[PDB]
Amino acid sequence: SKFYKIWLIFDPRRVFVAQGVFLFLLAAMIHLVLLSTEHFNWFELAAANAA
Amino acid sequence: SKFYKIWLIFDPRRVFVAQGVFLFLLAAMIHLVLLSTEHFNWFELAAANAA
Amino acid sequence: MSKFYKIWLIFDPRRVFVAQGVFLFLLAAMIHLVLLSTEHFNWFELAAANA
Amino acid sequence: SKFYKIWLIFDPRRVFVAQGVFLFLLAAMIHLVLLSTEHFNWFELAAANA
Amino acid sequence: SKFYKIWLIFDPRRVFVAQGVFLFLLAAMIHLVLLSTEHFNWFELAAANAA
Amino acid sequence: MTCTITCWGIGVLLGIMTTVGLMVVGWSFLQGAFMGVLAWLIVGGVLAVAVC
Amino acid sequence: PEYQNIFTQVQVQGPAELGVDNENNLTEERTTGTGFSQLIGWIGNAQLGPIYLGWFGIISLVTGTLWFNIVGFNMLSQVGYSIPEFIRQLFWLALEPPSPEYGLRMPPLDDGGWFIIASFFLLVSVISWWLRSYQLAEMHKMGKHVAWAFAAAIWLFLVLGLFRPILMGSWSEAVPYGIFPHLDWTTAFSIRYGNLYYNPFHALSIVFLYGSVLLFAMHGATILAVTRFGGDRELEQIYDRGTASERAGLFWRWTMGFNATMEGIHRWAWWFAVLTPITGGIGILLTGTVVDNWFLWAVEHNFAPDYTQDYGYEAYTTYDGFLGR
Amino acid sequence: ALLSFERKYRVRGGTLIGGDLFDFWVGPFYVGFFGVTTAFFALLGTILIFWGASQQGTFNPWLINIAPPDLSYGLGMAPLMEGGLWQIITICAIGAFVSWALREVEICRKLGMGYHVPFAFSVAIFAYVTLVVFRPLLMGAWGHGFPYGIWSHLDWVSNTGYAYLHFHYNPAHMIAVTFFFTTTLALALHGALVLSAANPPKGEEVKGPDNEDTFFRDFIGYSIGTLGIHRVGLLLALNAGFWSAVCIIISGPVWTKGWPEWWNWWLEMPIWPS
Amino acid sequence: MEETFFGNFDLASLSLWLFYGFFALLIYYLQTENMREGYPLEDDDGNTAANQGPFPLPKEKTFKLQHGRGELTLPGEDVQRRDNLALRKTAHGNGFPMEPTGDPMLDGVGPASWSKRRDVPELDAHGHPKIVPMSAAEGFGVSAGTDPRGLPVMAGDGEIVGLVSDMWIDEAEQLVRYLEIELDPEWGDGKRLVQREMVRIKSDRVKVRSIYGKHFKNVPKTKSPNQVTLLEEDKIMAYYAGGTLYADESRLEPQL
Amino acid sequence: LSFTGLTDEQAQELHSVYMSGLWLFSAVAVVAHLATFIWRPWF
Amino acid sequence: DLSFTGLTDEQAQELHSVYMSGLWLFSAVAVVAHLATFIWRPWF
Amino acid sequence: DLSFTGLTDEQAQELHSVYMSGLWLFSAVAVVAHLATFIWRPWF
Amino acid sequence: DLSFTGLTDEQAQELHSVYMSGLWLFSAVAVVAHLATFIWRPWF
Amino acid sequence: DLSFTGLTDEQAQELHSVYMSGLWLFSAVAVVAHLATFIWRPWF
Ligand code: BCL
Ligand SMILES: CC[C@H]1c2cc3[nH]c4c(c3C)C(=O)[C@H](C(=O)OC)c4c3nc(cc4[nH]c(cc(n2)[C@@H]1C)c(C(C)=O)c4C)[C@@H](C)[C@@H]3CCC(=O)OC/C=C(\C)CCC[C@H](C)CCC[C@H](C)CCCC(C)C
Ligand SMILES: CC[C@H]1c2cc3[nH]c4c(c3C)C(=O)[C@H](C(=O)OC)c4c3nc(cc4[nH]c(cc(n2)[C@@H]1C)c(C(C)=O)c4C)[C@@H](C)[C@@H]3CCC(=O)OC/C=C(\C)CCC[C@H](C)CCC[C@H](C)CCCC(C)C
Ligand SMILES: COC(C)(C)C(=O)/C=C/C(C)=C/C=C/C(C)=C/C=C/C(C)=C/C=C/C=C(C)/C=C/C=C(/C)CC/C=C(/C)CCC=C(C)C
Ligand SMILES: COC(C)(C)C(=O)/C=C/C(C)=C/C=C/C(C)=C/C=C/C(C)=C/C=C/C=C(C)/C=C/C=C(/C)CC/C=C(\C)CCC=C(C)C
Ligand SMILES: COC(C)(C)C(=O)/C=C/C(C)=C/C=C/C(C)=C/C=C/C(C)=C/C=C/C=C(C)/C=C/C=C(\C)CC/C=C(/C)CCC=C(C)C
Ligand SMILES: COC(C)(C)C(=O)/C=C/C(C)=C/C=C/C(C)=C/C=C/C(C)=C/C=C/C=C(C)/C=C/C=C(\C)CC/C=C(\C)CCC=C(C)C
Ligand SMILES: COC(C)(C)C(=O)/C=C/C(C)=C/C=C/C(C)=C/C=C/C(C)=C/C=C\C=C(C)\C=C\C=C(/C)CC/C=C(\C)CCC=C(C)C
Ligand SMILES: COC(C)(C)C(=O)/C=C/C(C)=C/C=C/C(C)=C/C=C/C(C)=C/C=C\C=C(C)\C=C\C=C(\C)CC/C=C(/C)CCC=C(C)C
Ligand SMILES: COC(C)(C)C(=O)/C=C/C(C)=C\C=C/C(C)=C/C=C/C(C)=C/C=C/C=C(C)/C=C/C=C(\C)CC/C=C(/C)CCC=C(C)C
């Protein structure tokens, strides 16, 4: 719609840096909770297979 | 697309340094994760194969 | 591929060369130290075994 | 090759001092590693040959 | 040959003191690691010879 | 200032919430307090820097 | 109430100060990259100015990182390269010194061999940093008081890890490279050699450690008390004594009967701090080489207190009484 | 006697109580209403120590030991030769320390300077107070204070430290010790700059504040300034006194187990995989 | 070695006595280094006292002052001594306070007393005056805190004496030193300086509590509006701190 | 109106590119999630 | 006309052209490397 | 154009040419060293 | 053309020729020393 | 032509000649010392 006006408030260079840092940290955190579980831990799951 | 405009916002000198340390640190972390697993530790696997 | 030479326009050759030299050696010492920790790739311990 | 141009980037004083300290530190380190082992320690090998 | 030009970039006053202390500490270190060994300890060997 | 201190106040308030929130779902006081202190420094610090 | 000069009420920031220069050409090794932090400027200077990098600074930093890496990477290998376990046990892991059976000889890498190599790089890094302090003072045409004071700290650093192990003839007497482990070594060191409280030099070093905190609280508060008379400009008060130096002197003269000057306070300050490791270095050197039991030394020299009361808890209460039953 | 510049500062007034009744100088010392009480309490405590030393049987300064009462006596008064003399000296010691701080207020008020010095001394008093009355009150007996002996009060530290099986693992001891080793480091470095700048090599002009300011910029890349070092130096010392009070007031009133066991919260966090 | 020289005097015991001798010499050296200023002692009447202390005066040391200001040998006659002090003894003997003969704040005695420093501005490394107004300074501005320029100045009794017109900074250390006060016609005539350590800055005003409204007209002035000499700094600062005790009788008299 | 000193036309141009990147980042994430659900469903 | 780094629109495409080529060259090796290690010890 | 370090387009070409030749020589040694190591004690 | 350190191109070539002369002399001693040690106690 | 230390070519040439005389003299004594101690107790 008219969401493009957000850049009249947010500095594009100041928000891109924050978005890039946030996205990677979020991705690493979700990848880490999976390994904490015993069901979705593909590293330990592969060891169980062919054993 | 027209993603080239990111360089009108990001300074190439500052971005290139940022991903240079990020890429290696990410690569070192993943290589270390495998060394902590019994299944993917290629150093310990070779010892077992010899015996 | 053939036009990567432009990286020297962004990067100062003086500081890149100094950083590369430190990183390359610190890399080389890391793997050499890693190998010496393993029981299979320790060339000093292997020579004693063959005695 | 054309490696002589490395001195156009690097200061001759700076490389030589850095290289001198770097070379000695390796030589002391590798010699110490040899002394650690039981097979390449030339001091105890002479003792064992007695 | 041509090594005499090393004095064109190294200050003789600065080198000699660095070249001087380094020789003594090295000589002291070797005389110490040599004394620690039982085979090459001339102080302990003389007592053994006298029996 | 009057905004950095206010943003710091939100951080310490969140840390108290984080401490009691983790104690409710188990954990312990010291375990909860550590994450509360950690949340105070990060969220409180980010708020004071992200907006002034 | 009156404004106590603990936080600056207003900060002014101008062009960055690149520092003074002379014919020694200090500027050619300076980074010339400055940044201003307002958070730290509430209590001190707000400028993170350029740092002089020479060769002693570079050598120390590179060799210091090698010691940091060798100790650190050994710890990571000890827990099998498990990063979550490395973080969890970070304060408990260490690089233990060699076993006592190897004497002064080079031990195997897994049994203290990497400790000696890492300690070699730390020794180089510390000495190089001392040379940088000595060189910078000479290039600035200033006194060598910074180098001499830092040499006093290195004296305990050398004695604790280099000089004493040689005198005992065993590399096993060094300090492990760990957060909690070097606290364990500190406690075990006192227990093994009697009671380190009864070491006269340990007692003397504590006198100068307490005096150091004592005197800097006294000096820090006195200068803040006279900062309304421009007392924070200590150097100008030495060359031209103002009312700030007079009142600061008279305050202590009326309190404890004698005082100092604006210069002489820093001679007291320098000497108490410098004597803290100098005296402790002598005490550690004599421990094991000469005494081997400090409480028995105290009993022999008649300064160990004697007690006449009983020792068991049965002489003061009962098990049922303590439990309230 | 006076100093070369002392006469113009010895003016009447500035007292907190007593006015000009006690407002005079004895030698270099300033006597106030609190200088009278300081003289009384300090002399009374000093004499009682030697009276107890006489009955102890020894006058050796190393061996003199005035000990608190037993834990059985609780918070009440004890016989003078069975621990009551220690309690009286503690009252005298507290009265002499508080009077000394209040006397410093009168002196710095007469000189028109700040009250930073008496406030800093109060932290030292607070550390002494939390060792002899505050902690014994929480633990319920006057026998938990340290004895008044040169070497006896080290034995109290040794046993109190080992009463928790490892006293280095105390989190507040960890913080408090870090402040001593740093305050001495700050004291050594600050005292070196002023000495180095004011005493350059022979034949060289003395250096100003700019030269020492740029030295640490060249040395560690950051200089806190002439005002900042005293401002942060007081804070490091005051924090050292405060955190040392914390480490001993939580040992027994707040924590009774061994101090290594405290860190079990970090080892057994739910986030750590098993 | 574990063998004693005599009785029970081993190497550890010998090192202890060596430190005792060294410490005694160190204390003697340290104390004499503190006697470079203020000695000989003198008495309340101004004559040299019969007692001078157990520590003799140290040997002369020379400071090579920069910017061509000559040398300075600290042990000697003091050029900072003040003359014609407006004080009278309250007792015929020694050890009793002096009573001012006039206005203590004007005469500069007690808490309001200054010292006869050099009548030249303090200089930075380059040689220019150290403290200058921000109007002369180039590239300097307020980066944090509350800007006090333009705020009214409220005295110790609540009177408003004027508004802050300028503010003097130490460009060498980037630190604020003084605030200029534009005195109102009802209270003063021109501009006065107050050091930053006696002023508390609020959101709408700056408060100085050591000086009442009527004491502002007598604050010492600077010879020039672009720099302040060491003597003027010492006179200005002493005046404000002297008001912490001489502003009114309630401050001088005991609080209890 | 414009706190960033950026005109309306530029902001509209900037948003269109940002949307194009956001969809591409989301499209990869969608494809990745079907792969994970097929291999090891969590519902 | 918009630029926060002083870069020109025409030369921004020039910089991005080689960055993408560096991206594909770096990624191509990684894909081959991941293919090689999946044959060695698959994780699925 | 687009000079951030003062180098010209023509200047940087031979600097990269020698660097790549130096890169290949360093990499060629590593391949030979790695090939010898795999024969001596294989890790696969 | 390009000289960050200041010394000229022909000057650089003169210094490098001497540096390689020293480098090969240092390496030649190392190779002989390494060869002698391998005959003494081989590590392969 | 070049001197980072402000010494002319002639001075450096004769400075090195004196330095090498000391270096060879130091090494000559060391060689005899190692030769003598090898007869006493060889380390090989
Ligand atoms: C059970 C414990 C034992 C004990 C065992 C010891 C032992 C063991 C020692 C002391 C020593 C000391 N003890 Mg004790 N001590 C005990 C009880 C006490 C008590 C108390 C209230 O009970 C106190 C206050 C003290 C106080 C002290 C200090 C007086 C003294 C330390 C000197 C110093 O400053 O070190 C400061 C010096 C160093 C830290 C070395 C500095 C290293 C170099 C200069 C810096 C290198 C930096 C490094 C490279 C890292 C840099 C990284 C940066 C990030 C870049 N002990 C009990 C009895 N004590 C020391 C001593 O004896 O002195 C004579 C000592 O060795
Ligand atoms: C911020 C904390 C630091 C600190 C600060 C500090 N201390 C201070 C001050 C400040 C800022 C002062 O202004 C004040 C002063 O004027 O010093 C010269 C002072 C002071 N701190 C002192 C000592 C002192 N400070 C110590 C440490 C510290 N104080 C900390 C490191 C220590 C330790 C821990 O060892 C000691 C021993 C004095 C020099 C002085 C206080 C003088 C005083 O109180 O005088 C009045 C009393 C007497 C003259 C005699 C009193 C005698 C008693 C009535 C009887 C004995 C009681 C006592 C319990 C005996 C115990 C003996 C055994 C333990 C051996
Ligand atoms: C004895 C009185 C006090 C004292 C005095 C003292 N210390 C001193 C001095 C003085 C007078 C100095 O002048 C000197 C100094 O430089 O001060 C700023 C110093 C100093 N003493 C220090 C600390 C210190 N002081 C201590 C204690 C004390 N020394 C007392 C409090 C102690 C203790 C408690 O033992 C310590 C640990 C240093 C801060 C400093 C000089 C040390 C130094 O810089 O050594 C050179 C080492 C390095 C530059 C590197 C060290 C290791 C790094 C952590 C590695 C880098 C890691 C990084 C993350 C890179 C990672 C790379 C990888 C990811 C690839
Ligand atoms: C865990 O680690 C373990 C496994 C333990 C380990 O060992 C890891 C080992 C690892 C990683 C090996 C890393 C080593 C490397 C990379 C070797 C680099 C070594 C090099 C490059 C040698 C150059 C030497 C040349 C010089 C230094 C001087 C030449 C001498 C001449 C004399 C110079 C002067 C000449 C002149 C002509 C004068 C000047 C002229 C004018 C002024 C005109
Ligand atoms: C399992 O869980 C755990 C363990 C937690 C885990 O692992 C979590 C991991 C997770 C979440 C991964 C997330 C990481 C991601 C997403 C990283 C992708 C990385 C990317 C995309 C970067 C590629 C960069 C390659 C380029 C681009 C090279 C280009 C190089 C060339 C050489 C440059 C070209 C030259 C120039 C430009 C010259 C300049 C030009 C001019 C001057 C004209
Ligand atoms: C366990 O221990 C292990 C680890 C195994 C170990 O030890 C490791 C050992 C390692 C790494 C060996 C390290 C290598 C070494 C040490 C080789 C360098 C040695 C050198 C280079 C010898 C210089 C000798 C020079 C002299 C001695 C005098 C000559 C100076 C003369 C006399 C100067 C004349 C003075 C003048 C002023 C000239 C006058 C003219 C003018 C003024 C114009
Ligand atoms: C169990 O729960 C646990 C696990 C606990 C949990 O916490 C669950 C997770 C939770 C709740 C997180 C909630 C997730 C959220 C909120 C997702 C936010 C994610 C978003 C929003 C994705 C944006 C993607 C935008 C991109 C990636 C654009 C690409 C940009 C492109 C590249 C364009 C860049 C610009 C240019 C190229 C040029 C522009 C300039 C000019 C045209 C001038
Ligand atoms: C836990 O980790 C474990 C599992 C242990 C692990 O191992 C994981 C390790 C991991 C992931 C690290 C992966 C390493 C990587 C990616 C490093 C690639 C290294 C690279 C790319 C560098 C090579 C090329 C550099 C040279 C060597 C150039 C030669 C330079 C030449 C010689 C200079 C010539 C220049 C001139 C002559 C100048 C001329 C001047 C003018 C013309 C003016
Ligand atoms: C993420 O990054 C990576 C990098 C991966 C990582 O892991 C991070 C690294 C991590 C976490 C390591 C953290 C380090 C820790 C906790 C170390 C604390 C250190 C402590 C407490 C020091 C104790 C006191 C030491 C003394 C007192 C020495 C005295 C000895 C000196 C040195 C004398 C010299 C000794 C010798 C023996 C001489 C030998 C010489 C010859 C033989 C010539
Ligand atoms: C018999 O075998 C059977 C049983 C059949 C079998 O095998 C069953 C298996 C089956 C069915 C498949 C199960 C596996 C699956 C599904 C694998 C998951 C697949 C995944 C995870 C896809 C990865 C792609 C992620 C990338 C590659 C992202 C790239 C991210 C980029 C890099 C974005 C970051 C870059 C930026 C620029 C953003 C920054 C922006 C600004 C700064 C603005």
Ligand SMILES: [Fe+3]
């Ligand atoms: Fe000071």
